Design a protein around this ligand. Structure first.
Ligand SMILES: Nc1ncnc2c1ncn2[C@@H]1O[C@H](COP(=O)(O)OP(=O)(O)O)[C@@H](O)[C@H]1O
Ligand SMILES: Nc1ncnc2c1ncn2[C@@H]1O[C@H](COP(=O)(O)OP(=O)(O)O)[C@@H](O)[C@H]1O
Ligand SMILES: Nc1ncnc2c1ncn2[C@@H]1O[C@H](COP(=O)(O)OP(=O)(O)O)[C@@H](O)[C@H]1O
Lengths: 509, 483, 510
């Protein structure tokens, strides 16, 4: 029995740590790296995956939230809260003399009963702009400081709606997330096109091009090796300059080949041309192409070249000797954005990019990383909302209704497993107990009002954080995903089954 | 805090586990009165060995009840009880409760009381003969004083046969033993009435009286006045008519002259315990003052005279006109320590037949009836369903510890004895007990040897032993209080 | 909050102590007095009122059984176990941040719902001989070795019926307790009259008298002092004895009227007379009354003379000058039974003595005093059954039926008060959990078994101590008093309120 008491109290202490960062009104935790990096966040995955815990027993719980975040993308904080309360209530019966094997049988019955209860209370509302805003409000409110809610809410909703058509499933690689400094935090908005880190830098370039045919290239326009059967052999510094005249024939002659294609394909006025070559470019090639109204870009990422193929439609080229008009693209407004220090290329208003850009703006580094995770945690919350046509009410409204179904439920397998259902009932009610404390109100007084709410109808009752009264989560726009609670009750029972069945703890090296 | 009570009673048995049987070891008893004693009697160990652990005292109070209504089986109280709790720990190791084990023993005690009459093979013949008492008292001589099986078998029989005709009036209080310094046991004898080793101070030979009363010029004037004072006291006795005066203190040289002047027999008894025996026989009490002439505190005896037996002048106090039921066994011994050990074996023999005044039933011993009793209780435990099987089965193994004590104390291996005791009883050879022999681990019939215990003794010995194991197991925690 | 955790952990240890000695399957406990006496018992009131406890907080709980014993006399073992489990469950709610005062109001509301539910379970059936036999067997089983159950059951029940009739209020003073040694434990019986300690000392007294008259007196017939204004006028020691006869002359003449009172009041053969004088009597005065066959007793207790007036009817007389036959009592077969140690007089065969004596027999003192605890504990349970005709089924049948009611109970006082009702319900369920361990069965199997029994009528099931099955306590013959369970709901909640209301602990000179 002593092998469990070390594991029981290990989770109880872990319960008191992560309970103060559930919801928006809760506190945050600091991550001291020791090298100079400091981070703030409420998501339990970062408080367990990147953080180092002293106890090995608690280290196993960290790997649960790591895999939980990979499936659903949210709810990892309450996953550990139910686990810490499951073993808390199990210890109350273990002191009386009950073996843990029967208690796991009770959780197995309540887990299947509660999973059936989700099928009754889930709401299959049609997915649209107004409903997803109510969902994205739930995921992003707990990752910001109560000001970026309405700012970031419209971003994540319209981002997914732009990349969902023809009944195509959702893919997270269809969104290019970029970051910009020297700006405020509320300037985070959506960019229709793709943002490039490095762009054209020459005075003879156009500030903006209303329409330009984007040519995709991969050719090296800097000092390269000899392309014919020869080499670099000289005797002095002046003789070395003669080899520059020979090697540059492979670079300089390729600049004019782009000019020949410019006059060929739409060489008249009211047109443009943009080269998006991944390799570096010599200034002589920049000055030669800048005068011709041809914007030459360099130093792009490997993934940006993949999205650039989709934006304009031009196929990736590897040599200008293989140049042809078939690999030419087309885009709308192509210009350069100006920050306080640096400048970036913008190719917005594309034809059929099938790839959007969520451009993040923030003044600090540690604050930009907080929004970095909230974007990935906000995009995935609504991702499961559309892929899973059914949703459930938030505000902890599923937990208080679940307690009514399981107390009014007898096991049809055996008697002694009924107490495991009683423990699973009080373990789920810890979420309205946690949020009542993070809101600053009484823990139990908030639980009474939400539990006492009954009526002769289907009544969804939740927790009000601003006043502390019973809140109907459907009336206020508070919703979650159906796969979250389904993975919650499916995951939390397996871990409690694996840990409670540990009879002895042997030191294996 | 349950096992600490089991370890307490477990140690108390191991002390008397070795003092059991005829080959049992002796004990170095150091009295609280700055005296040294050496014996193997288990009853005297607990009187001196102050076991302060109250968990084991319940076994001692059970052994004290083995002194009331019976005078044998003291080792049965300590060995059978001590072996019951030793195996009880094996049950609680598995996870059994205390009440189911107690209830299993309460049932086994009823099953054991019904098997014991079936094993009653022989009994006494009820002839009031000396050969009948001496032949059966060999069981009481065992393990109290070995080697004197021939001497004491007849000596004890001589004192009891004088009272057996008084049907329903035989008691151990009627047989008072005396011991005198001598060469050895061969000089022992048996006499009727109360016989005291102290000689008669006066020169009176025989008297049939019933009244026995137990109790420079100026320098020479008071010295002779004391002679007139002492004469006035013997005159006060002569006024009462008491010819037998038992003196508890010292006697003056002049009192011996006045005791013979008025023809008064004067006897001195310095031992107070010998004076107390007269209080309960003739009715005469010991008065503190110098010879109170109180005719009410004087006793009644038909005859009083002086005798000489074994070269020792001893006064006789018998009853000729009355029925008479008092007998005195006078033993002789050179060592006072060993001489008293014989005195206890006599009291053990007198009390053995005191119980046989009831319905005479005997059972062979020596591991014969204890395995036969454990063989039948195990049969009830195998077929009896329920959780009581573990307690009843071990209650039979508690009976096995007694012959295991007889084996180890005899230097014989304990396992080989029970293996042969079970093989002879598997074939039905009842009444087959262990043969006392350091070299022969074999067995034989004890009925042919003349070893027979008391059926009425094993009953109260098995009942008080099992009830003590229940009283000690019901108490799971000892808690101290301050009045 | 840490100061409150001490009183919680203090009574938690006292719960683990008095949980194993509940019921006949439970264990016993020893009292080491240190002087040379050892006592064995199961009743929790005896384990706390005479015992001294290490912790200071648990010592306050010891006084609860002291006040509880004056009301009912039983149930003190289960009172501490309910108190231990209440504060055990309440600690789980205070640990989350709830105040103790909110939980106490929850128990105050659960008290009424639990007390109101008690009106339904109790049965108003007529108490008869067959009903009380079920009651005595429920109490005495926890004080004996499962062998004196039927022995003492018939003694306690008949002792009550023989001293109460016509709805008369009963009193415990009417039953005297006596103990005797040199006998077995199963020989306990009843006495029609009163057993006296000191008897007569003379061979000429009648060993047994079928019929004899009683005479209550308080006059010492020994050599007494002078009554009139005189003195000792003498000149030698021989004259001193002459005036001793004068101080005895007033005494000797008073005994001669006693023989005259016997000769006038049935001075024919087939008659008798028994004097019950409390004061001493001279051997010469006994010699004069013994010739007439008068069995005179002396050196009795003051308590017996008061009981002798009720049993025999003879009025106490203070002087033999006013000797009249009006103050003469009467007795039936008056004898003196001879035992192994002493002799004791019996005045049995009375028409209506209004007092019985339960003669206990046991070999040891710790066994004799243990049965004495079973008598007073078994008698009061029957006293509570007749004085209060309402009784309820035991076996935790009241606690389980009450616990099922509290879960299906809405908050009728306050909102957060329901939490204390949730805790008070889990506390009453410890009784079937306690007896499950003493019986050796699974603690959880016993609970859901008795709880799964539901029907459309009255159904109160209980614990089967021998098998563990859900068994009806009403049919098998298990019944408890209405006042016993009534005090548990008032004592356990009022005491548990006082422990949870302690905020801090300050040392006042300790
Ligand atoms: N303001 C609020 N009031 C009530 N419940 C809330 C509030 N905000 C979030 N919740 C609930 O808290 C749960 C966890 O939300 P979230 O913070 O997104 O996940 P995690 O706590 O795992 O990071 C959700 O199931 C939601 O119903
Ligand atoms: N020579 C022997 N042969 C067989 N059995 C013996 C012998 N000596 C002793 N015993 C056994 O030892 C037991 C104890 O004898 P005893 O000493 O008289 O009683 P206690 O041990 O109570 O003092 C007897 O029951 C008897 O069967
Ligand atoms: N075998 C049993 N069957 C039913 N009820 C029992 C049994 N044993 C004990 N009880 C219950 O335990 C309660 C307390 O018994 P007891 O300990 O003798 O009195 P107290 O607890 O007041 O000292 C009784 O009211 C009785 O109903």
């Amino acid at each position: 029995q002593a092998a469990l008491a070390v594991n029981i109290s290990a989770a109880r202490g872990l319960q008191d740590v992560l309970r103060t960062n559930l919801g928006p009104k809760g506190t945050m935790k600091m991550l001291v790296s020791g090298a100079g990096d400091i981070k703030l966040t409420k998501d339990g995955n970062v408080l367990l995956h990147e953080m180092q815990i002293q106890h090995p027993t608690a280290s196993l719980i960290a790997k649960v939230a790591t895999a939980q975040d990979d499936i659903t993308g949210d709810g990892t904080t309450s996953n550990v809260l139910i686990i810490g309360e499951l073993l808390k209530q199990a210890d109350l019966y273990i002191s009386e003399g009950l073996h843990p094997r029967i208690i796991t049988e009770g959780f197995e019955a309540a887990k299947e009963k509660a999973l059936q209860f989700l099928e009754e209370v889930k709401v299959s509302r049609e997915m649209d702009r107004e409903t997803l805003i109510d969902v994205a409000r739930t995921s992003l409110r707990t990752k910001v400081h109560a000001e970026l809610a309405d700012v970031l809410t419209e971003a994540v909703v319209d981002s997914i709606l732009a990349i969902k058509k023809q009944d195509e499933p959702i893919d997270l690689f269809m969104i290019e997330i970029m970051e910009m400094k020297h700006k405020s935090e509320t300037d985070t908005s959506l960019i229709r096109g793709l943002v490039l880190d490095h762009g054209a830098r020459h005075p003879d370039m156009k500030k903006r091009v209303e329409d330009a045919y984007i040519l995709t290239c991969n050719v090296s326009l800097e000092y390269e090796k000899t392309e014919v059967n020869s080499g670099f052999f000289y005797k002095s510094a002046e003789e070395r300059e003669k080899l520059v005249k020979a090697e540059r024939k492979f670079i300089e002659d390729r600049v004019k080949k782009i000019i020949e294609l410019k006059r060929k394909v739409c060489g008249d006025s009211d047109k443009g041309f943009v080269v998006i070559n991944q390799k570096g470019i010599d200034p002589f090639s920049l000055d030669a192409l800048s005068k011709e109204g041809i914007v030459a870009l360099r130093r792009a990422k490997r993934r940006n070249m993949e999205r650039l193929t989709l934006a304009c439609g031009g196929v990736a080229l590897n040599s200008f000797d293989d140049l042809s008009p078939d690999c030419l693209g087309h885009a709308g407004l192509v210009y350069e954005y100006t920050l306080g220090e640096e400048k970036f290329t913008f190719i917005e208003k594309c034809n059929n990019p099938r790839s959007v850009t969520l451009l993040i703006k923030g003044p600090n580094k540690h604050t930009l990383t907080q929004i970095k995770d909230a974007v990935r945690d906000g995009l995935r919350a609504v991702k499961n909302a559309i892929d899973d046509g059914c949703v459930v009410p938030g505000a902890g409204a599923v937990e208080v209704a679940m307690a009514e179904a399981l107390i009014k439920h007898k096991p049809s397998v055996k008697g002694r497993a009924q107490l495991g259902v009683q423990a699973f009932a009080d373990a789920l009610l810890i979420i309205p107990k946690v949020l009542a404390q993070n809101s600053g109100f009484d823990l139990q007084e908030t639980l009474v009002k939400i539990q006492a709410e009954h009526s002769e109808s289907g009544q969804l009752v939740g927790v009000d954080l601003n006043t502390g009264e019973p809140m109907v989560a459907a009336e206020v726009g508070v919703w979650d995903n159906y796969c979250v609670k389904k993975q919650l009750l499916h995951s939390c029972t397996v871990i409690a089954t694996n840990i409670l069945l540990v009879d002895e703890i042997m030191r294996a090296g | 805090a349950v096992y600490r009570n089991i370890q307490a009673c477990k140690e108390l048995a191991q002390t008397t586990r070795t003092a059991y049987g005829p080959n049992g070891m002796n004990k170095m008893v150091i009295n609280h009165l700055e005296k040294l004693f050496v014996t193997n009697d288990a009853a005297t160990i607990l009187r001196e060995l102050e076991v302060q652990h109250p968990a084991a005292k319940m076994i001692v109070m059970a052994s004290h009840m083995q002194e009331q209504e019976v005078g044998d089986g003291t080792n049965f109280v300590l060995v059978f009880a001590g072996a019951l709790l030793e195996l009880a720990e094996e049950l609680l190791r598995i996870g059994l409760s205390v009440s189911e084990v107690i209830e299993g023993y309460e049932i086994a005690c009823r099953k054991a009381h019904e098997i014991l009459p079936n094993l009653v093979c022989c009994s006494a013949k009820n002839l009031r003969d000396i050969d009948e008492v001496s032949s059966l008292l060999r069981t009481s001589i065992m393990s109290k004083q070995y080697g004197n099986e021939v001497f004491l078998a007849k000596l004890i029989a001589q004192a009891c046969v004088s009272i057996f005709p008084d049907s329903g009036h035989f008691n151990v209080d009627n047989i008072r033993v005396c011991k005198i310094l001598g060469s050895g046991i061969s000089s022992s004898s048996v006499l009727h009435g109360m016989v005291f080793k102290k000689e008669t101070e006066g020169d009176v030979t025989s008297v049939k009286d019933a009244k026995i009363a137990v109790y420079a010029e100026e320098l020479m004037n008071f010295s002779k006045g004391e002679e007139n004072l002492m004469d006035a006291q013997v005159k006060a006795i002569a006024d009462t008519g008491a010819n037998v005066v038992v003196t508890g203190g010292k006697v003056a040289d002049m009192a011996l002259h006045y005791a013979n002047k008025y023809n008064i027999m004067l006897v001195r008894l310095n031992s107070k315990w010998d004076l107390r025996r007269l209080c309960k026989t003739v009715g005469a009490t010991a008065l503190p003052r110098l010879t109170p002439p109180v005719l009410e505190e004087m006793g009644h005896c038909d005859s009083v005279y002086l005798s000489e037996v074994g070269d020792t002048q001893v006064v006789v106090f018998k009853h000729e006109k009355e029925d008479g039921a008092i007998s005195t066994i006078v033993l002789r011994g050179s060592t006072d320590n060993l001489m008293d050990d014989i005195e206890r074996a006599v009291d053990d023999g007198v009390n053995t037949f005191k119980v046989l005044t009831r319905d005479k039933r005997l059972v062979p011993g020596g591991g014969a009836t204890e395995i036969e009793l454990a063989k039948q209780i195990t049969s009830y435990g195998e077929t009896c369903p329920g959780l009581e099987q573990y307690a009843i089965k071990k209650f039979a193994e508690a009976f096995e510890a007694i012959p295991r004590a007889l084996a180890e104390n005899s230097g014989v291996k304990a396992n080989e004895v029970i293996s042969k005791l079970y093989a002879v009883h598997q074939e039905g050879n009842k009444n087959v007990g262990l043969d006392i022999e350091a070299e022969v681990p074999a067995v034989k019939d004890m009925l042919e040897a003349g070893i027979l215990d008391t059926y009425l003794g094993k009953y109260w010995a098995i009942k008080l032993a099992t009830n003590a194991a229940v009283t000690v197991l019901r108490v799971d925690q000892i808690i101290m209080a301050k009045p």
